[PDB]
Design a binder for this molecule. Structure first.
Ligand SMILES: OC[C@@]1(O)OC[C@@H](O)[C@@H](O)[C@@H]1O
Ligand SMILES: OC[C@@]1(O)OC[C@@H](O)[C@@H](O)[C@@H]1O
Ligand SMILES: OC[C@@]1(O)OC[C@@H](O)[C@@H](O)[C@@H]1O
Ligand SMILES: OC[C@@]1(O)OC[C@@H](O)[C@@H](O)[C@@H]1O
Ligand SMILES: OC[C@@]1(O)OC[C@@H](O)[C@@H](O)[C@@H]1O
Ligand SMILES: OC[C@@]1(O)OC[C@@H](O)[C@@H](O)[C@@H]1O
Lengths: 88, 88, 88
């Protein structure tokens, strides 16, 4: 079936839910005022996530896997980009 | 195989492990005194979870997926009910 | 495909990413100075993780599933061992 991963921060809270569906990962967002579709959209059959909130900054790492390849996607306040993670 | 999701809170800690097995999700609980079966029992082939502890209250969100449909289940101190999450 | 689970702690942060690939789970680690392969290596087709940081101690629980059997693996500062978790 589709596969999801979820993270949250703060006391509102903010929630992010990533869904791998038919080889694509998309993102749904809650910040206390309704669910909406987030900027994250990348290929993947499987997804995991972790996040850490430091001061006023949320940092999110999304691990997107297709076949035997995992790509780390990083949110550090300014859009999503690929991170240095490799599986080795 | 079966698929799991896990969350924890506090310093004991409390742990909740959700297992999607044969289309059903069940919950195992640790609060420092042995594992036991929790109240959560809902359909699903895939599960993710996030939680946040505010004051004396734990809030848990379990995302249960079957086919292309994801249902959010909410614990806010008074049993499990479906939440407003949709995948859109 | 391969399946992952991720956790993080502190402000560096430390990150651990577990990958179930071809029936084996391995671990990649970030502590602020490059990714490296961690000590965790156990059988599994599916993996989830949770962790909690208390004082100077990180506690990690990895739930590794093969077929209908889930094994909990515990890090409490001194290597990985099986924990008391059962699915019942
Ligand atoms: O709009 C909210 C948003 O910026 O929050 C941080 C990340 O979750 C982004 O993908 C998302 O678009
Ligand atoms: O700032 C990005 C980065 O350094 O963050 C920590 C890890 O997620 C790394 O893989 C990643 O490249
Ligand atoms: O009995 C413990 C319990 O109430 O803890 C909160 C939730 O995890 C519930 O499903 C569970 O039954
Ligand atoms: O109190 C329940 C609720 O508002 O909590 C925040 C989100 O999980 C929503 O989808 C959900 O309906
Ligand atoms: O070397 C870093 C390490 O000790 O960190 C704690 C656990 O993640 C271990 O598996 C790992 O080897
Ligand atoms: O110290 C190990 C242990 O007691 O930690 C809490 C739970 O993870 C238990 O299953 C596990 O045996």
């Amino acid at each position: 079936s589709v596969q999801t991963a979820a993270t949250s921060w703060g006391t509102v809270p903010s929630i992010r839910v990533y869904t791998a569906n038919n080889g694509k990962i998309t993102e749904r967002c809650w910040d206390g005022k309704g669910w909406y579709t987030g900027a994250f959209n990348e290929p993947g059959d499987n997804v995991s996530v972790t996040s850490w909130l430091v001061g006023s900054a949320i940092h999110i790492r999304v691990y997107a896997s297709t076949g035997t390849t995992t790509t780390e996607w990083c949110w550090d306040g300014n859009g999503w980009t690929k991170g240095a993670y490799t599986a080795t």
